[PDB]
Structure formats: C-alpha cells, structure tokens
C-alpha cells in the first residue's frame, strides 16, 4: 500500500539527493586535491551505476500489483527511469571531466618542478668573473639552451592542452586557467634567468 510508495519515494530520494552531491561538487586546485576528488567521485560514480539493480528490481515486481494500482506505480517508474538517467549522465560527465583535468594538471606540475629544480641548479653555478674559464662557462650556457628548446616544446604541447580543455568549456576553469598562468610565468622567470647569465658571458 504506502510502504509501496514510500519504497520507490525512497528510491526516488537517493537519486535526488546525489544528484544534488554531483552538481555541486568541488574539482580541486592542485595535483592533491584534484586526485582527492577524483578518487571520491570513482566510489560515487561506481555506486550509482550500482544502483540499477534496485531499479531494475523495482520494476521486476510490476507483475506483483493488482490491475488498479498498476498504472500508479509504474508513473512513478517512469519518474525513477528518468531521474536516474539525468543522474548517471551527469556522473560521467564529472567522471570524464575530473579525469581530463587530473592528467592536464599531473603534466602541468610534473613541468612546473622541472623547471624550478632547473633554477635552482643554474642559479647555483659560479657565471661572475671569479670563475675565469669563459670557456667552460659558455659549454654550460649551450648545454641549457640545448635543454631548454627541447622543454619549450613540451611547455607549448601543455598550453594547447590546456586550450582544448577551455574550447571544450572545461567546468574547472579556473584551475586549468591557473595552471596556463604558472607555467607561463615559470618559463617567462626561466627566460629572465637566460638573460642574467648571458650578461656574464659577454
């Protein structure tokens, strides 16, 4: 009777209220936080795919009710089969979403340490006068060069990525907005850091 409609009541509030869970969810800022919510919204995703069967189970008592109450019950399916699909839709699309901007920001930070641990040892070495041999100064200043247009490259790859992801009209915008911006000023600090030790080389 009502424990009927409170079942599929029941099935029908479960749907609602992680619809409410996926809409509003976070994406992350960082490699960390990114990983965070991706690995939560795998349990969730799994979980909701999960759920069919108690759908499916739903629908498979139909044959049980008697011809008056038939048709009640299977409107409220009806509202079921599709709240659900809005559901399962939109988990995937987050799923997809959160897996595009995990590997886009691992590639970005994984190029960001590069770069600053290049830094930090080219800043290190001795270019003043006190070093006398122009020589070994100017094999080194070629070796970074040498490296450095091979890493610029990869650099351009990740800004287009980054680019498409944006076209796409990624929902974490901002982060991979953020993740442009670093690497941009990164390269542009690395630039700077050229220009400095050429003055020496001159």
Request: proline share 2%.
């Amino acid at each position: 009777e009502d424990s009927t409609l409170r079942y599929l009541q029941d099935l029908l509030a479960w749907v609602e209220e992680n619809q409410h869970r996926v809409d509003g969810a976070e994406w992350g800022v960082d490699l960390p936080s990114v990983e965070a919510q991706l690995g939560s919204h795998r349990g969730l995703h799994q979980s909701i795919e999960e759920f069919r069967a108690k759908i499916e189970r739903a629908r498979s008592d139909e044959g049980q009710l008697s011809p008056a109450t038939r048709g009640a019950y299977r409107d409220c399916l009806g509202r079921l089969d599709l709240q659900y699909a809005k559901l399962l839709n939109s988990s995937k699309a987050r799923l997809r979403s959160l897996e595009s901007l995990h590997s886009f920001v691992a590639a970005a930070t994984k190029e960001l340490m590069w770069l600053n641990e290049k830094e930090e040892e080219e800043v290190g070495f001795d270019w003043s006068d006190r070093n006398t041999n122009m020589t070994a100064k100017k094999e080194s200043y070629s070796a970074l060069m040498r490296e450095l247009e091979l890493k610029e490259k990869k650099i351009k790859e990740l800004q287009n990525a980054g680019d498409r992801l944006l076209r796409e009209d990624h929902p974490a915008r901002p982060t991979v907005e953020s993740f442009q911006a670093a690497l941009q000023t990164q390269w542009s600090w690395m630039l700077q850091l050229c220009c400095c030790i050429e003055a020496h080389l001159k």
